Write a protein that binds this ligand. Structure first.
Ligand SMILES: CN(Cc1cnc2[nH+]c(N)nc(N)c2n1)c1ccc(C(=O)N[C@@H](CCC(=O)O)C(=O)O)cc1
Length: 158
């Protein structure tokens, strides 16, 4: 199964290259939690951004150009899946363009809403509400570790 998990700021704006203006460890924890024991596919950018391969996961990248580290480097949305093997869940941590490629063959969404105005170009692939049912709804404000109000939404493609 293929799903999508991402941190989208107001206006639906996502990552680009430079790190997003926030520090929500909560989301991070939610990431680990929903990602552990699950293969992942990510764009070059997020790759260099994480700084290190994700522990206890299958580090796969979709680009285009060579592959640095000796993570499963794929060069197509096809190879990617195969390298994911026979798992019950596929974790696509984008970024941007990566997502778009998984949206059609996508079946689930694990996003956290950040009520922060953050300029930028790229956005998250549009999707008609009813087409994606609404299961979860956990909203949390900002306290001491999370510099901004976030919100959890798991969408099951309807
Ligand atoms: C730059 N990114 C990509 C990133 C960040 N937040 C996201 N948040 C959500 N909800 N979705 C996606 N796809 C996200 N992707 C990124 C950077 C660092 C960690 C990270 O350090 N994760 C540790 C948890 C935190 C730690 O410092 O150990 C982990 O084990 O997953 C994850 C992702």
């Amino acid at each position: 199964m293929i799903s999508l998990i991402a941190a989208l700021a107001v206006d639906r704006v996502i990552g680009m290259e430079n790190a997003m203006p926030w520090n929500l460890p909560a989301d991070l924890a939610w990431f680990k939690r929903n990602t552990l024991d699950k293969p992942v596919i990510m764009g070059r950018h997020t790759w260099e951004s994480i700084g290190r391969p994700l522990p206890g996961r299958k580090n796969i990248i979709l680009s285009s150009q060579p592959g640095t580290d000796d993570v499963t480097w794929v060069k197509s949305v096809d190879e990617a899946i195969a390298a994911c093997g026979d798992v019950p869940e596929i974790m696509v941590i984008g970024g941007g363009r990566v997502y778009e490629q998984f949206l059609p063959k996508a079946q689930k969404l694990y996003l956290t809403h950040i009520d922060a105005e953050v300029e930028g170009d790229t956005h998250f692939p549009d999707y008609e509400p009813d087409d994606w049912e609404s299961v979860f709804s956990e909203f949390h404000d900002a306290d001491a570790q999370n510099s901004h109000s976030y919100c959890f939404e798991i969408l099951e493609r309807r």
